[PDB]
Design a protein around this ligand. Structure first.
Ligand code: NA
Ligand code: NA
Ligand code: NA
Length: 327
DNA sequence: CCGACTCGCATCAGC
DNA sequence: GCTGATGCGA
DNA sequence: GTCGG
């Protein structure tokens, strides 16, 4: 459903969602507007009235009205007022820097810090994460074309294997489902030396390696199971430098790896469909395990999982390739 | 009418 | 010092 | 803001 179809309504709503998250700090209002704006992007019909829209799941009365004012006039008075509000402007913008959330942004704008220049004038009051968000502001808002991701995947599989032949790594996310474009790289790692009933240097030895070969240029966080940081593909000595990109590497107990792979892969709507369908078939699925729901509602022990396919067998579902996992 | 709408890591509040 | 809260991102 | 117990 193209941008000309019902794009104007959707940008409105998303603009409204941003301000609820960034200025009002009303995360559920943020997720509301988003939810409305998303189902609206599904509807294959240039919407003609708020009434029409209200028939959808997630469009309530108040949004129906906003669409009504949008449709009649071309704009929403609330947005325009918000659009040219100084503090709201600067607050909403500053959150675009990774590491600055609405609380930090609101604090910066309190003491006059409103623009990247202001941030740059004040490395002092920026934690480590925020400086990397500043540093890579432009690079981080860029998407990653699939061939770059495919290239990045080469480096990650090669060096991980080179650290140990026992590691298992899967780039998940949209990419794994076939998407011609991604916004970050989501690596799921595991070893046979790591069960849920069990070493605390398994992730550091892969992180280190990828810094030795100068793939990982920066670090936002690293612990015993999650690394978040920056990487960038090597340039041609003549051809321009690639933009730095965000990467996440996550260590998972091998007895839960294929559970996490499915979850960190499958689309949102797919994942609900399956945890909708798993319950009616008597099992419960979270990111970690699959447990059988006993008669009176009580979940039992987690059952073996050793493939993605396995989990479909438990719930009586044909395995679906990640490419066909849109919903 | 009224509550619902996950978690590992950095960092701060408080002891 | 250490525990727990809160922010952030995802 | 929206849904629903
Ligand atoms: Na952001
Ligand atoms: Na941010
Ligand atoms: Na933010």
């Amino acid at each position: 459903p193209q941008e000309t179809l019902n794009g104007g309504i959707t940008d409105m709503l998303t603009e409204l969602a941003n301000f609820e998250k960034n200025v009002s700090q009303a995360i559920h209002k943020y997720n509301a507007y988003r939810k409305a704006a998303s189902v609206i992007a599904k509807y294959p019909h240039k919407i003609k009235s708020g009434a029409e829209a209200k028939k959808l799941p997630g469009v309530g009365t108040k949004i129906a009205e906003k669409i009504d004012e949008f449709l009649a006039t071309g704009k929403l008075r609330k947005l325009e007022k918000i659009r040219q509000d100084d503090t709201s402007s600067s607050i909403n913008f500053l959150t675009r820097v990774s590491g600055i959330g609405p609380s930090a942004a609101r604090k910066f704008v309190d003491e006059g810090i409103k623009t990247l220049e202001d941030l740059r004038k004040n490395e002092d009051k920026l934690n480590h994460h925020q400086r990397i968000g500043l540093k890579y502001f432009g690079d981080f808002e860029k998407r990653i074309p699939r061939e770059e991701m495919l290239q990045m995947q080469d480096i990650v599989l090669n060096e991980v294997k080179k650290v140990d032949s026992e590691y298992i790594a899967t780039v998940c996310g949209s990419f794994r489902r076939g998407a011609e474009s991604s916004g970050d790289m989501d690596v799921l790692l595991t070893h046979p030396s790591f069960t849920s009933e069990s070493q605390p240097k398994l992730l550091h030895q892969v992180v280190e390696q990828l810094q030795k070969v100068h793939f990982i240029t920066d670090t936002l966080s690293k612990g015993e199971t999650k690394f978040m940081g920056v990487c960038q593909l090597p340039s041609k000595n003549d051809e321009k430098e690639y933009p730095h990109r965000r990467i996440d590497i996550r260590l998972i107990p091998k007895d839960q790896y294929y559970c996490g792979v499915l979850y960190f892969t499958g689309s949102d709507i797919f994942n609900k469909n399956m945890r909708a369908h798993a319950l009616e078939k008597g099992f419960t699925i979270n990111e970690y395990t699959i447990r059988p729901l006993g008669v009176t509602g009580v979940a039992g022990e987690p059952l073996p999982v050793d493939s993605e396919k396995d989990i479909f067998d438990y719930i009586q579902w044909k395995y679906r390739e990640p490419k066909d996992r849109s919903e």
